[PDB]
């Protein structure tokens, strides 16, 4: 046996339960934005402890396991996926991924072990990078007009959310600047899988 302390075990979630959260399939960027807004609007946790995390790569083909779109027989290959990360004071980070079949929220190390998995034997073009944006900056800066979800014929790929598009004074659309894993573009910091797990893993 092996045993560590001190530790974090009565963690109260920063969000409502999964089934009470704002959610539209295939609008993870917005689902995460709405989690960030909830946290900002409540007095449980400081917003400074929370991050939006975009997962993608140059080829926009990233596997994630433990996904509701294909349970039991992962991975799902996404163009990008977005989750919320909360760094709690208890010694410990948590992932809030409304699309996971893991718990909501899930301990960071579990999510990385079971949903992300190692890149070591993954074909290099499918390896994962992580853009980590402070929640306050994500709320300040993110904008999407949803135009990436409307095909050539003007049909929606998946139904858009019913509330108005997220826009800022500076932009009506900058989604690509968050999907990008070019560290010279956009906001926040871009990490390799190893760097990401080094920063947040226990």
Author numbering: 1 to 202
Q: How does the study describe this entry?
A:
The human C8orf32 gene encodes human N-terminal glutamine amidohydrolase isoform 1 (hNtaq1). Ntaq is an initial component of the N-end rule pathway and converts N-terminal glutamine to glutamate. In the N-end rule pathway, N-terminal glutamine and asparagine are tertiary destabilizing residues and these residues are converted into secondary destabilizing N-terminal glutamate and aspartate by deamidation. The N-terminal amidohydrolases are classified into the N-terminal glutamine amidohydrolase (Ntaq) and the N-terminal asparagine amidohydrolase (Ntan), which share low amino acid sequence identity and mediate the deamidation of N-terminal glutamine and asparagine, respectively.
The hNtaq1 protein contains 205 amino acids, of which 202 have been successfully modeled in the presented hNtaq1 structure. Three C-terminal residues (Lys203, Asn204, and Cys205) were disordered in the crystal and could not be modeled. free values of the final refined model were 14.4% and 17.0%, respectively. hNtaq1 is a monomeric globular protein with a novel structural fold of alpha-beta-alpha three-layer sandwich architecture. The catalytic triad (Cys28, His81, and Asp97) is highly conserved among Ntaq proteins, transglutaminases, and cysteine proteases of diverse organisms. In the structure of hNtaq1, Asp97 forms hydrogen bonds with His81, Tyr111 and a water molecule 1 (water403 in PDB) and His81 interacts with another water molecule 2 (water444 in PDB) via hydrogen bond. The N-terminus of a symmetry-related monomer is anchored into the active site of hNtaq1 with the side chain of the N-terminal residue (Ser1) in close proximity of the catalytic Cys28. The surface charge of the binding cleft is predominantly negative, and several hydrophobic and aromatic residues (Val76, Ile77, Tryp78, and Tyr80) are well oriented to recognize main chain backbone of the substrate-mimicking peptide and to stabilize aliphatic part of the bound substrate-mimicking peptide. Overall, the active site bound with the substrate-mimicking peptide directly suggests possible interaction mode of hNtaq1 with substrates.
